Design a protein around this ligand. Structure first.
Ligand code: SF4
Ligand code: SF4
Lengths: 367, 367
């Protein structure tokens, strides 16, 4: 009777301990002392790990302003993979964190060959505007473009290039083009620059990521240590989330549009994508009733768990019912659909106004 | 009877034509139309080549403001190798060019492992202050640090990283560390950024260099062409000088201090370095009188030709006399010494005041 899936995380939390990644539960008491209750993603163990988030919460409890930072590639449409990250920002923002959102338009240009005008458009109208419509505060959130962030941020990138080898970078990202080399240093600057006085002096910063992104984060923490004597930087903290599988059971992508719901999908389009999702269902109505289903492998159940059913009781009932033989996939899908239809409609009603607001929250680069 | 050494330059001007480098003499008529008389380095064929300097002079003649740009590595002491470059800047500055001088402090840090505080010190008190004492105008010269030059300059570096391959860079500089990769893009930005409106909009820029520096300049001209559609850049022009050999007949270096006169050398120290220089002299006083000497291989004669004797007649007389058997190396050295002693004394009398002025011509970077 395992709705949260504790046994799926004990298996590799052993291996991640090698990199100093800890179970998230060890910060519960610090989370309390900081006056914070866990979010539902924390309760459900979707946020399963942390490194140094205790130090962040210690700073926060003695009254220091603390920050969270993440970046977005302005390519393709905003989807529920992206929403999971923003939802973790909004939680932290409501609990007092300064939020920084980097737009990776330099990487978009140099690595992905995305045009300047288009990167900027997509960043504002697809990324920033969807983030605002989700509930990220337009006033207090600091959005910026990698190509328009200013001298002190770029000076770190210049000085970092002396503190890492080609082999170190190769180990993380593969073949080392000038563009991928630049992107790797710029991403470390995205994390660390908020610690400079020019950007507000936020020494304690947490970055929410998947495990698969830890190698770059470790190179960033090395860069902080290697800058000692030049500029004093703290190693960034991190929280670790399990990635939501796409509706096909493969990785969630704007590329493979059928297995990702976009936040801008019209209701008929989203419903059909949802109804086509892979489930843990069985041969037939008949066989499902005797044995029940397998929520552990069902992308509908993961949509409920990660997004559509914040209420623990309600998503437990789905799990129980499916595991007891009480529910078929057709009805389970329409239940998830009704939650999604309401979410999309309220979100989309906010989006045209968010887009207007968005063009005023940033200075686009001149070229 | 060849004082200028025309036959030493016809030999490889053939090979450099492969790269579109032309004899400098082809710009003489443009130089006239621009209201300019050749400098002595041009007359002597020490400036032997150009690429696209005609386009610069065409812009200048129709009244456009034109620019020259070069960079200096703030490492070690300022020597007569550096003076040859500044002398070409001063000539162009007196003929109306805007001069830009880049300090390579990012490269100094990341590639050469030179500390921040020391790079900055050396740049101001050893490089900028010696340039001012030489006659570079403190008001109209634009000096800057790579690490403090601002957003639009750094954006080029970020966008350039998408337009060059690892193999292209490898071909120019060897093993491709993150630092050497960064330095190569930053050096192209040093040349091209002056064309942006933010730095004055100087589309027509000339860079004075040795032939050995042309591979990087060609990659810079490729980067200009490859940016079409993103930001419109003109291919930079260049003039080409023969390098002055050190007093030992090897390359002139702060590393091998005996074969370079530093502008700050006290008179006794410079005199001795000069008196130890390799000459084209012979076994003995006796054998020199019959045959004469060999100025073509004499580092004393090259000091006269590149610096100490601007007057064509006077340096011709040295050549003639040595080639006629009329002069021994001891007297030739003391003649060159008297010119150098006067030059050093007037230069050094200007230097303490130049250092004061220098700290006001730049904003040093904060870290
Ligand atoms: S009944 Fe629901 S949770 Fe169970 S396998 Fe089907 S879609 Fe998934
Ligand atoms: S006489 Fe002068 S120019 Fe001739 S070889 Fe000696 S030092 Fe050189």
């Amino acid at each position: 009777l395992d709705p949260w899936g504790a046994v799926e995380i004990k298996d590799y939390d052993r291996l991640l301990r090698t990199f100093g990644i800890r179970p998230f539960s060890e910060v519960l008491p610090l989370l309390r002392k900081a006056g914070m209750e866990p979010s539902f993603l924390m309760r459900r163990g979707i946020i399963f790990g942390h490194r140094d988030f205790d130090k962040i919460l210690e700073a926060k409890a003695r009254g220091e302003r603390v920050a969270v930072l993440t970046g977005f590639m302005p390519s393709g449409k905003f989807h529920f993979g992206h929403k999971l990250t923003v939802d973790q920002l909004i939680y932290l923002q409501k609990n007092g964190f300064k939020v920084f959102v980097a737009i990776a338009d330099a990487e978009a240009f140099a690595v992905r060959r995305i045009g300047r005008e288009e990167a900027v458009r997509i960043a504002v109208e697809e990324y920033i505007a969807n983030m605002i419509a989700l509930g990220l505060d337009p006033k207090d959130t600091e959005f910026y473009f990698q190509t328009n962030r200013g001298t002190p941020y770029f000076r770190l990138i210049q000085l970092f290039s002396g503190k890492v080898t080609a082999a170190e970078m190769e180990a993380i990202y593969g073949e080392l083009t000038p563009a991928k080399m630049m992107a790797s240093l710029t991403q470390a600057a995205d994390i660390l620059h908020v610690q400079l006085d020019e950007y507000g002096g936020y020494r304690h910063v947490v970055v929410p990521v998947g495990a698969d992104q830890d190698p770059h984060l470790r190179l960033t923490r090395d860069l902080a240590d290697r800058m000692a004597g030049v500029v004093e930087l703290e190693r960034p903290a991190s929280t670790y989330h399990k990635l939501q599988p796409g509706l096909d059971g493969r990785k969630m992508s704007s590329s493979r549009p059928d297995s990702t719901i976009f936040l801008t999908d019209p209701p008929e389009v989203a419903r059909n994508k949802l109804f086509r999702a892979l489930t843990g269902g069985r041969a037939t109505a008949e066989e499902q009733r005797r044995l029940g289903g397998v929520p552990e492998v069902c992308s509908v159940y993961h949509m409920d768990l990660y997004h559509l059913m914040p209420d623990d009781g309600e998503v437990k009932h789905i799990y129980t019912s499916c595991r007891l033989g009480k529910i078929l996939c057709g009805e389970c899908k329409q239940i998830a659909w009704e939650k999604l239809e309401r979410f999309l409609a309220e979100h989309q009603s906010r989006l045209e106004k968010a887009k207007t607001i968005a063009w005023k929250l940033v200075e686009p680069p001149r070229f």
